[PDB]
Design a protein around this ligand. Structure first.
Ligand SMILES: Cc1cc2nc3c(=O)[nH]c(=O)nc-3n(C[C@H](O)[C@H](O)[C@H](O)COP(=O)(O)OP(=O)(O)OC[C@H]3O[C@@H](n4cnc5c(N)ncnc54)[C@H](O)[C@@H]3O)c2cc1C
Ligand SMILES: Cc1cc2nc3c(=O)[nH]c(=O)nc-3n(C[C@H](O)[C@H](O)[C@H](O)COP(=O)(O)OP(=O)(O)OC[C@H]3O[C@@H](n4cnc5c(N)ncnc54)[C@H](O)[C@@H]3O)c2cc1C
Ligand SMILES: Cc1ncc(Cn2c(C)c(CCOP(=O)(O)OP(=O)(O)O)sc2=O)c(N)n1
Ligand SMILES: Cc1ncc(Cn2c(C)c(CCOP(=O)(O)OP(=O)(O)O)sc2=O)c(N)n1
Ligand SMILES: [Mg+2]
Ligand SMILES: [Mg+2]
Lengths: 581, 589
């Protein structure tokens, strides 16, 4: 029975609970209904408060802070438009399993925007706090739900009269057996397999000790490892067993491995549609091996309702992937590269047949090169380097041509795919990792969505580095329009603002590079700059992201780059567009 | 039976439905789920398409288009984040009754219709190509009828990529008897309303956005007020429904309304509420609202007459002595012949009390040094547009500047006020102005914007530049969230928690965006800068550096009754600034 809250207001109690929860940073924006909380946190020493230009920036900043730190991002906003503005961040956090706690002012309880109802389908949980006494309880509930199981966003409603009111009174197995049985069935299934593969996702990064255990099992039994977009960095991409990223824009060899493997080991990962291609043509070899009782698909998942949602698991290992790997690594029998000479020989053949470094290459900077060079210039510091991206081609290229070695280095919007996520998430990651190098690799359209937040980085002296790729197009959509609609480019081009005058207007140091010789010096300038800075890279237009497995394709039915296709495509487009492209 | 669509994709059907609906402009942003619609409208000649920087911008531009033109704003976005980014404009449109049809791409059959159910007037997911024309027509009909509002239409990719291969489809006595009976009830309630007015000795008209949204509404309002010599006050959204230069104008009422409007409302024996919903920021403390009118109802000599199109909305906030259901313009046509004419001389007592209040509490009485006063910016914009009020549209952000333009611009033209009132979304003004300018290409459209409001959506300046949409922007630069610092002064003893921001350089920003620009800080140069802005061609921005910590007055604070307002007092203002300077140790003067 607690009594250290009598005589304090709900805002003052809320201030105490942030301390008890270890909240060191809060992102938010005031308004009428949330004003009692802003009075309580006035000139606080418990945490730093970041005031953005827009609540959507507050929301994405909290996401990047969580992605970089594994701590929950915390947001405080007012009722009405304050809350509706954080819906895209919340839905985004929900889609990508990012822990977030969002507090909203509400009108007084007596007087009934339906913030709670509007947000049911876009949060992991939400609650309206109906009395000042409930306040420590709900706040604790909210923080644990947001971080338990699959982490997610939680919305807490703060009625003004609750936060302004004053507290007067004092306020308050045999499944394990079947788990071990499932672990044993999986080890048998791994050992039995001759063509195994690890398919690792963000669940590994979000489990304590996860990447290390990933390394162990993959080393001991010499199993090749591929990851999703969110799994990037859960395994050293320089390791010889690395297959890199699979899926819609994965490496053609990672796609080959998955399509021909007979034992697939799914760690984290929810088998998203941008990973599997058409699901009835996905993992044929592992599916036959399931039917021939000689292999299949193993799926380590912490959420019961996520299992067999998309693909049927041969054996399902329910619970924390890190803990369950500690009971599976024993029961797996070691192997060597020599053991799987035949398997790795096909893998290594695929790597030479389809290298990620085989893309058209002078005069106009190539966007893949920018990612190669950012990778090169930071190779000596990848344990202290974080990348935030927008959404589009640039997002895929940096997945492809950047070598991920550090877990949580990839800060990107995957499930929802929110353009504009990049810059705010970078700002939040750099608040989380002040002594790290945080780069926002951004396409100009994604960047045009939220570029008002440069002012947040200037006002607070947050040293993010921004690379804007300037191709004057919605690149990902032009690709699709070239592919499926014969170069009819419908509303996919924008006039950019002068990014150099813009960075100047915002109080951000800046340079612009357009000549491929000077590209590396420019990038070197950006990294070694002190305080926030922006580099504008003028790139080539109409550059496809390959490999791509398009809509309706199996996963092995990917397209890849051939210089005769690239010559032919651009000249068909030059004629269709009548010289404009 | 309609065969014209055989062989058409869902996208091409959509394209044709826009033509049949007479849509002339669409605001949107492509994505994967919606690509078949974009392929079908590629280089269309039937409407202009505005690509914004952010889908929130597309929505607010559609709002401003609708607000300036009375036509629905049409939005087209993709699934997931394309759809969640328009939730703020949709909730905004719902709260303010703005007709809007939002088309969202959807993956083949975010939870767009789940997350948007509570923030739309109606939503529908089209399930097959065959039903697309029927649903399109349903959406426009719902969006524009009754109280207008936003309607969300989910468009699954299989519906818009799919092909239609087949044709599709295009009064009793009991009904007739019931029809006559309901007409007689309406006519009865109109007579009673008329009788109530005729016995009133201190009548007042309380006019809202419903009058602007009704065909003939402002004309009929003027005829009524003229014939019976009734003074007219309006809400924030009703500004421009009545000529504020007429001797019968009480200007805006409510939390920041003219003191003479709030007095008149509190003394009136008959209140004629026309197309208004008695919002809490209008009535003050409801139980203390309109005491004179409530007493006159008790004694059978007056009360509150409410003209309202949504029958359900009557008696939800204030008890009506006489309700008149339906479209306020149609019912005023029937009301006016039954109201007996009165001269201003017949109402000498009433207008003399009002002239008293107007003399005692003039809106022009505010602190008037070397820093530009924000109130004075508004008065000068009103003076400088004296000859073109019929072609001038004002969009605003949310905050003090929004109250000041409501108070000191003299409103004369229906739909000239374009502002977010119900939800109160900061960032509305600039996109809404762009939308209004698209709707009225030959009108003067001005975005009067606070700096924090402007900072939310300033990226949309690139939209005005790319499409050469000549909006005029006035940014009031006080470096504060002025409305919140007024609340923090009032209730939290000058504890200014997180309500100050460093702006960007607005001249460098405007230049970066390709917008001609100017900055003004000296009171002697304000008029010429405003003259410069108003006479430019193409988009233009004027930054006005203003005084700080200026309270909006008059003010009915929370928990006070409508007649319990605070007014400007030069000595109280001096004490306030003195105490603020002490507590902030000279930081805020
Ligand atoms: C334009 C675009 C292109 C894309 N291209 C690709 C592509 O080519 N390839 C690709 O892979 N992705 C791609 N993505 C991203 C893709 O859509 C998904 O967001 C992503 O693949 C899913 O990542 P994940 O399954 O690893 O992690 P999540 O989606 O976060 O799910 C991880 C799973 O692990 C579980 N989990 C979490 N914590 C634990 C724990 N401690 N123990 C056990 N389980 C746990 C969760 O419940 C969840 O089911 C693209 C996105 C966009 C917008
Ligand atoms: C900080 C702030 C301060 C504010 N201060 C004030 C203030 O001092 N004073 C003020 O007035 N507002 C103020 N507002 C705005 C206020 O919150 C409301 O948005 C506004 O008062 C509502 O105006 P309305 O009733 O005219 O319009 P609406 O909210 O649109 O209501 C119109 C009503 O008319 C009905 N209607 C529509 N069409 C018709 C028709 N054809 N026939 C009949 N009925 C119809 C609708 O159903 C509805 O009931 C403020 C807002 C903010 C954010
Ligand atoms: C908020 C929002 N709106 C629309 C989309 C649809 N969309 C769009 C318009 C893409 C093109 C991104 O353009 P960019 O300039 O940011 O990057 P690239 O040129 O590298 O593709 S990618 C994509 O998914 C989206 N993901 N998010
Ligand atoms: C999107 C959003 N966030 C927060 C608020 C809360 N709020 C805030 C923060 C106001 C201050 C706006 O400051 P401004 O610079 O735009 O204008 P003034 O300085 O003239 O008040 S007014 C108001 O209602 C809001 N209405 N909308
Ligand atoms: Mg681009
Ligand atoms: Mg301001």
């Amino acid at each position: 029975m607690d009594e250290s809250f009598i005589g304090k207001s709900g805002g003052e109690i809320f201030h105490e609970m942030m301390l008890r929860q270890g909240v060191k940073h809060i992102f938010g924006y005031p308004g009428g209904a949330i004003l009692p909380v802003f009075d309580a946190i006035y000139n606080s020493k418990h945490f730093d408060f970041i005031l953005p230009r827009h609540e959507q920036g507050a929301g994405h900043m909290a996401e990047g802070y969580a992605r970089a730190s594994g701590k929950p991002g915390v947001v405080v906003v007012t009722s009405g438009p304050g809350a509706t503005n954080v819906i895209t961040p919340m839905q985004d956090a929900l889609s990508d399993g990012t822990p977030m706690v969002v507090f909203c002012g509400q009108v007084p309880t007596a007087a009934i925007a339906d913030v709670v109802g509007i947000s049911r389908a876009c949060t992991k949980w939400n609650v309206m706090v109906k009395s000042v006494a409930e306040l420590p309880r709900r706040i604790n509930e909210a923080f644990e739900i947001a971080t338990s199981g699959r982490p997610g966003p939680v919305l807490v409603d703060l009625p003004k009269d609750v936060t302004a009111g004053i507290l007067r009174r004092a306020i308050p197995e045999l499944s394990t057996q079947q788990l071990n049985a499932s672990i044993k069935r999986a080890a048998d299934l791994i050992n039995m397999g001759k063509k195994p593969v690890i398919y690792a996702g963000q669940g590994v990064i979000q489990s304590e000790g996860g990447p290390e255990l990933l390394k162990e099992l993959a080393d001991k039994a010499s199993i090749p490892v591929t990851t999703t977009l969110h799994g990037l960095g859960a395994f050293d991409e320089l390791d010889e067993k690395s297959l890199h990223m699979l899926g819609m824009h994965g490496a053609a060899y990672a796609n080959m491995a998955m399509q021909q493997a007979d034992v697939i080991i799914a760690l984290g990962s929810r088998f998203d549609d941008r990973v599997t291609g058409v699901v009835s043509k996905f993992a044929p070899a592992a599916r036959q091996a399931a039917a021939e009782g000689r292999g299949g698909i193993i799926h380590f998942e912490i959420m019961p309702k996520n299992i067999n949602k998309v693909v049927q698991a041969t054996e399902a290992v329910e619970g924390d992937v890190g803990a369950n790997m500690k009971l599976l690594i024993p029961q797996v029998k070691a192997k060597t590269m020599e053991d799987r000479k035949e398997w790795f020989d096909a893998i290594k053949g695929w790597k030479k047949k389809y290298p990620l470094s085989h893309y058209q290459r002078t005069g106009l900077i190539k966007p893949q090169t920018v990612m190669e060079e950012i990778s090169n210039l930071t190779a000596d510091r990848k344990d202290k380097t974080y990348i935030a991206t927008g959404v589009g081609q640039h997002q895929m290229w940096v997945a492809q041509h950047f070598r991920w070695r550090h877990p949580r280095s990839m800060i990107t919007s995957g499930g929802l795919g929110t353009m504009g996520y990049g810059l705010p998430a970078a700002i939040g990651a750099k608040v989380a990792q002040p002594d790290a190098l945080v780069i926002d690799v951004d396409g100009d359209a994604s960047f045009n969505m939220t570029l008002t937040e440069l002012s947040t980085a200037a006002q607070f002296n947050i040293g993010v580095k921004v690379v804007v790729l300037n191709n004057e197009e919605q690149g990902m959509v032009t690709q699709w329009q070239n592919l499926f609609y014969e170069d009819r480019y419908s509303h996919t081009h924008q006039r950019n603002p002068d990014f150099m005058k813009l960075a100047d207007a915002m109080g951000i140091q800046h340079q612009r590079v357009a000549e491929p010789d000077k590209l590396v010096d420019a990038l070197k300038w950006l990294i070694n700059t002190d305080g926030p800075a922006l580099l504008e890279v003028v790139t080539d237009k109409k550059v496809p992201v390959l490999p791509m497995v398009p809509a309706g394709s199996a996963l092995h039915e990917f397209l890849v780059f051939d210089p005769e296709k690239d010559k032919q495509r651009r000249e068909l487009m030059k004629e269709r567009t009548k010289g404009v492209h």
